[model samples]
Target: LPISMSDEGDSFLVKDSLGENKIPKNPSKVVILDLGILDTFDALKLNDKVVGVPAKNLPKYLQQFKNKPSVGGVQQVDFEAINALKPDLIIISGRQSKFYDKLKEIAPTLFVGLDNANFLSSFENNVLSVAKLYGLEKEALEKISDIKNEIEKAKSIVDEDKKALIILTNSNKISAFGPQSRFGIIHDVLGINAVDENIKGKSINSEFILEKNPDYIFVVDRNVILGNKERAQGILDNALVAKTKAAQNKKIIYLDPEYWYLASGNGLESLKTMILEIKNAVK
Candidate 1:
């Protein structure tokens, strides 16, 4: 959707995470600090609308956008690089929430935060809201419909009768997620049962795995994203976890943490790749 001026005047007021503000209906040049929003732009087929973004480790598919000028990442922004773009709008989220005041000084800023409490709904609203800004509500809904279809299709392949465990291994420290964590898409959204519905904290012990003995294990190794080749597989390929049903049946699927840990899993492109990964494992 191309940005445009509001019916009332040159720009319309949108109530976003940052409160109400006048946003150009069609923002010709935009700089987004949030990859999730960038993912949405990628979905809306407005990739070129973005003129500045941080140089983070993008998934292979998103690498195409890397050629754009690097501004800054999750926690920082290059004011000089951003000012050069003369952005009509700047989009940000939790990571750069502190930069809100500073960025708004540059241009009209919108905070399209993704709600972790109700991830999909927030993502839906965020994407649709952006679409509304560009008069591309029709296209955005179609993209949304595409995601729902793939989600249902992917759910069909998952073994709901079986219990699954989501583990996040960062270096030697161990953490487990249930239906509530970002990794919850496995047990929470996909209809798979979690070994422990109580799993919440950021750390876990080996005996917890042995006792739960889940049917499947979905892992997101944080170390890999930190530039380490070795991951949870090496740590999980041990006596206790290996004894579980998931390990015995070779059902432990190591997910791409780049998507799960960092990017928006509900984003259009991310969901497609994620569904494919899960389908490959379940099929």
Candidate 2:
């Protein structure tokens, strides 16, 4: 189902996650705070229309828009910068959910963050809605089909019986994500088997990894790209963790924190890149 839209004379009534929004049709200037949607805009051949973004932590794939107006970080938007841009529309995600009202004062804002429980559906809808806004529905569908095919290719190669664990390391602390959590796209959409179904946000350590002994360990290290003191590789390199099958078998997959954490579960190219990484691991 495509996004529902109605003509509001000069504007279009758009139904986003937050409800209806009357946005300017064919907006010439746009401010994008969500990398995933920015990825979609890039895929839809609409990058030239963008006027501003949170330039900090811009992934390599979406770096072309980095030189645009810097709206600050994804979590914290500079209201003055956004207001100065005078964008026709502004798109954001869960990280900027709290700034909706303030942003609307500057331009028509849309919330298109992915739903952790229903990731794929929400992702497609978000992409399509933005596409419809810019009259690029055809282009969006083509990219989405490519993404689905990639998903199928990944699903075919995965050994579902082989248990896997996804852990995120922030400096010295570690947290695990389960199905329906932030990183659930692996198990929930990609059909990979979780080592533990209830490992959501639990404070895990080397002892837990050893006991679980998952066949595959997906590690997302926040410190690697942030120039922090403690690294994930160093933190996980211990007597207890080395005893696990993942470490012993060289199956510890260190995912790129840019795609996994900063712009995860959103964007066309980012998701496909993520799928290929996991698919390559299985191969």
Candidate 3:
């Protein structure tokens, strides 16, 4: 675990990103604003604690929370439903940083960010942070073990000889990620060769994509991650990119927006599922 934990009788000392936190006990009613972390709660069997979640555009896999009280949009907070729920803890992330101070007034809030430089390790530590608070670290570790096996299985099949590219598009704008960027997990953790590792952070270059035309194309569509149901096959459908080796052979992997973007940073299940998705495509 990245943070230390100690049980002092009734109260607990749990270290996390914000700092050392002391909770008399696990919060009875928890409200998770982030989908990835929310699913982490699901994996931990803490459904009862998740009293609320942002209800709009919730992924189908997470339909269990569809009936749960709507706390508002993931990036936007609904004070009424939350005030009514009166949760003991509220969790937020990159998308929800706007309401941090405000939510703290409602209740203690947690802010967790995943690092792409060491994506899996950082995610595991973040998992342990919450799990430690509930004394469920063992279960979290078990989940990590299962995810590790899934990753290994994918890695075992990956053609290390092939190079890959990670791209983001939303019908208009475009951007690229390397080993240090958000989608770096594609190269850093998955052990795929980044077609171009010399590019700066958040760089977008279709020309480079054409010049270096990689063997595998990994795409994340912002529009779909937010609401649209996509085939996970069209974001990279362009005249320039279509002629690449990945396109000709159908090596392009359409990623799950929720797993790759919305909840990409948290949850062992999501990481494992997405990895397996890519593995099957390559196989």
Candidate 4:
């Protein structure tokens, strides 16, 4: 069955799911399970409406929300804390959280899938999906247009075929992202190519870095950097990695692992930062 509606006397068409369009009336108090949703809401200037957010996954600009109610991490939510917030709507990511049933029981929740290879499309869908929930579809379209223009401007300044790699490092152990990973979306959106696309879908360990050499490496350390030099050096002590081109040219970059690994929206900002960092590093 097709779903059609006349909003304020204007007709519109939509896909019918479960016999009706299960749209929320209005989501004033919302709980966000993923930082990406927080990023999207922040882009829309709707931060004031958020009632709860994850303790660790908030956007860089919304650090003030750190003291707000904690709904736990993306995959492991604090059920008690979420219940206390009593939100009208809950936002989650398919790639981040697997506990959809638990979240749905608390409030009307929407699950958005990560952009494993199609970052722009996934991000646009997330923005528009949330906007439709709040009856702000028009605003969402305007926001998307603005972001699209910004991407184009950035692309004009950077080379399209520049080779890069996004990797997660812990005690010199590395896990590289290929076309099948979330970070690969950055390459897809920017028209950049990975140095080792053949490594896609492979579960890489520390030894894997020795075989798949890349021109430039973006590292996300799992451990926090203390004042100790030894701890910091341990992050780059992989003997196998030292033989790669990135190491010889001092092209290894350290990024915030929490932002890139756990937070989807934060990853976008980090990607831009990585691009700028690469621009300066290459020069």
Q: After superposition, how far is residue 112 of candidate 4 from its true place, in Å?
A: 1.5
Expressed as tens digits, the lDDT of each residue in 158-235 for candidate 4 is: 554456777765453456676657666446665556767655534465456657676677765655432122332475
lDDT value for model 1: 0.77
Q: Which regions of candidate 1 are displaced past 4 Å? A: 1-7, 199-201
Whichever of 1 and 2 has more lDDT, that candidate is 2
- Model 4 sits at a Cα RMSD from the real structure of 4.9
State, as a TM-score between 0 and 1, how close model 2 is to the true structure.
0.95
Clashes (N, CA, C under 3 Å) per candidate: 4, 0, 0, 0
Could you give candidate 2's per-residue lDDT for residues 1-283 as a string of tens digits?
Answer: 2246787777789876665678877898999888888887787788788998889768887878868889898767899988888898998888897888888877888888888878888888888888877788888899889989999888988886798899999879888888988889889888889888683477888888888899999999988666798988888888998888898999999998889888885898889889898889867
| Residues forming the 10-long window of minimal summed lDDT in candidate 4 | 11-20
lDDT head-to-head 2 vs 4, winner: 2
Give the residue spans of candidate 2 off by over 4 A.
1-4
lDDT of 4 at 259: 58
> What local lDDT does model 3 show for residue 120?
79
Clashing pairs in 4: none
lDDT minimum window of 10 residues, candidate 3: 226-235
Q: Between 1 and 4, whose lDDT is larger?
A: 1
Residue-level lDDT of model 3, residues 1-283, one tens digit each, is: 2545678877667665555555656778888887888888888988888899888858877898898899988766798889899888888777776776777778777777676666778788878878877889899999998888878887888888899888887655567777777777767776888887665336565666788888988888787645555534454667877888988888777687878878874776677778778778778
Instruction: Give per-residue lDDT, candidate 2, residue 100.
Output: 82
